[PDB]
């Protein structure tokens, strides 16, 4: 009866709108108020997941429907299931930790924390939206906060990166809007935008293919798909590391979530048509990004291309029409949200001390900064698909989903299985080299770098608190999969003969 999801969506942006009533200077009160709001919201989502979400239910849960515009038949409609609660919890966790890690920011702290809370609200509103136009609105609601965060707290090339990001996202999202208009106006009697009634809609093959292309262009601009990935390297490389958490851990997974929710669920026939061509694209994306990563002298650009490489396993699990492949895609979503954010955070904190960019001049950092060396090595191992971490089990489950797939027969099933395997040969080749060019060797450092130079309690806590779920999922993957084994099956139930 109580509007839980509406309260969860509204609370961060509504609380951040009141951050301008504070007449205090500095950043202390602003950052403590922002972390209070973030932790209260996190506890609210924890209560919702604990007491009102049932992982055994394949249906929509905690639905809320309020008619907002009559002409479009447009409703503020919210609802969660096994697909959305994982991204919602990840969004809350990563956004709270990014607010905590953005504490040295003393320039325009009020606007920074307001934009962080706005990003919180927009991501949560996207992940819990059951209306197509509401989905599009929540998709669009992050162009301005990320643009401002990039252009006001980014790197050397922040302005060009922000312009490229906003223009690329608008270019994808106009195709998203065209797909929304096409799907929502297909009704013979009246327009409809609810996903529940749209999941039973029947389209001709050509119109379904056109709608799939219209949605897929947007979901390939957002989730990096070759060759619509060029915004990502300069956007993530020249962004603040706290913003890089949201960019590489949350915003990248939104394209995959839209692919499951819309392309995979609403339009199954066009998805079955397009998936074998998506498999080759994902494998070539893995190889292409894992080969582009050694060519990048910049550390953050290398990490961004690593993120592009890791998105290929999600693409494969999407295109492999099995329950196991979709479960592996969700597991890789969670694993990458836990790995890329921490890697970007460590890179930013290390740059705040070393103040160097290109890898060929950052030797010997392990001598003054051993703890950040340890965390960087551990998160590289997590990136390396090492067992005991979530990445290995995610890639293994994706491999199993391909092997167990019934759509493909033998030879492609070989040539793709070999394919990503080449990727996990290329993934060490730069990553360890990165460490070898960033921590190994001897350099004579200043005496002032002997003390008060390593990561403090806050950075250690952030890295540990993102590292622990990685180990917890790599040991017991069903800490995540059990939330979405049922709903994924329902998503697969439309892909078989009926």
């Amino acid at each position: 009866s109580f509007p839980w999801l509406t309260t969860i969506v509204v609370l961060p942006i509504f609380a951040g709108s009141l951050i301008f009533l504070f007449p205090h200077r500095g950043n202390k009160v602003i950052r403590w108020y922002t972390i209070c709001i973030s932790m209260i919201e996190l506890l609210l989502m924890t209560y919702v997941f604990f007491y009102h979400f049932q992982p055994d239910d394949p249906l929509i849960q905690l639905v809320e429907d309020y008619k907002w515009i009559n002409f479009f038949d447009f409703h503020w409609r919210l609802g969660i299931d096994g697909l959305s609660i994982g991204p919602i919890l990840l969004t809350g966790f990563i956004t709270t930790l990014a607010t905590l890690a953005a504490w040295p920011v003393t320039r325009n702290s009020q606007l920074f924390h307001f934009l962080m809370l706005a990003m919180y609200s927009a991501q949560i509103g996207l992940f819990s939206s059951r209306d197509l136009l509401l989905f599009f609105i929540m998709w669009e609601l992050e162009l301005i906060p990320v643009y401002l965060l990039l252009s006001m707290w980014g790197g050397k090339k922040r302005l060009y990166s922000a312009t490229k990001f906003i223009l690329y996202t608008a270019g994808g999202s106009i195709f998203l809007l065209m797909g929304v208009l096409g799907v929502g106006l297909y009704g013979s009697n009246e327009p409809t935008l609810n996903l529940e009634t749209l999941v039973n809609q029947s389209y001709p093959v050509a119109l379904e293919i056109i709608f799939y292309i219209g949605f897929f262009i947007a979901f390939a601009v957002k989730l990096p798909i070759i060759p619509l990935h060029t915004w990502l390297p300069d956007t993530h490389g020249e962004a603040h590391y706290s913003t890089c958490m949201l960019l590489a851990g949350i915003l990248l997974k939104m394209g995959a979530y839209g692919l499951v929710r819309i392309n995979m669920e609403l339009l199954p026939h066009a998805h079955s048509i397009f998936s074998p061509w998506l498999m080759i694209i994902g494998t070539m994306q893995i190889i292409y990004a894992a080969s582009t990563s050694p060519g990048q002298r910049n550390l953050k650009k290398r990490i961004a291309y690593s993120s592009v490489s890791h998105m290929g396993f999600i693409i494969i699990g999407i295109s492999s029409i099995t329950d196991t492949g979709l479960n592996g895609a969700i597991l890789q979503i969670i694993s990458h949200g836990f790995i890329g954010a921490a890697l970007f955070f460590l890179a930013g904190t290390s740059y705040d001390r070393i103040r160097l960019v290109y890898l060929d001049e950052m030797g010997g950092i392990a001598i003054p900064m051993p703890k950040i060396f340890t965390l960087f090595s551990s998160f590289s191992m997590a990136s390396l698909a090492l067992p005991g971490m979530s990445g290995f089990i995610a890639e293994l489950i994706v491999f199993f989903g391909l092997i167990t797939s019934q759509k493909y027969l033998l030879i492609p099933k070989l040539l793709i299985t070999f394919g990503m395997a080449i990727g996990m040969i290329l993934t060490p080749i730069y990553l360890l080299s990165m460490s070898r060019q960033m921590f190994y060797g001897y350099k004579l450092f200043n005496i002032s770098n002997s003390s008060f130079f390593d990561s403090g309690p806050r950075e250690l806590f952030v890295s540990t608190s993102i590292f622990l779920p990685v180990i917890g999922i790599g040991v017991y993957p069903d800490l995540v999969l059990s939330l979405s084994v049922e709903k994924v099956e329902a998503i697969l139930s439309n892909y078989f003969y009926r």
Partner: protein, 93 residues
């Protein structure tokens, strides 16, 4: 009960013990809940803690502000300030 013995000719016999065990969804929710409260506690405690580098003079004295581009802007600013100081010195003299 949950124990199977297989005999193979020319091979040592095998005794297999099996236990199909899985965590309940309540236990998983408890793990998630405890990790959320641990995250909140750590955020509070380690935000209340002192930061050895970001509160130091080595960071704030150089012009740091938590912003990722302060180094390049500070460099261009000190070159422009040197040129302006030369202009001031030539104006005074």
């Amino acid at each position: 009960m949950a124990v199977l013995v297989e005999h193979v000719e020319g091979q040592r016999d095998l005794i297999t013990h099996k236990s199909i065990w899985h965590l309940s969804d309540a236990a998983i929710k408890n793990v998630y809940l405890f990790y959320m409260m641990f995250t909140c506690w750590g955020c509070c405690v380690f935000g209340a803690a002192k930061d050895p580098y970001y509160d130091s003079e080595q960071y704030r004295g150089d012009g740091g502000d938590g912003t990722g581009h302060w180094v390049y802007e500070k460099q261009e600013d000190i070159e422009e300030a040197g040129r302006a100081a030369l202009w001031r010195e030539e104006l005074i003299e």
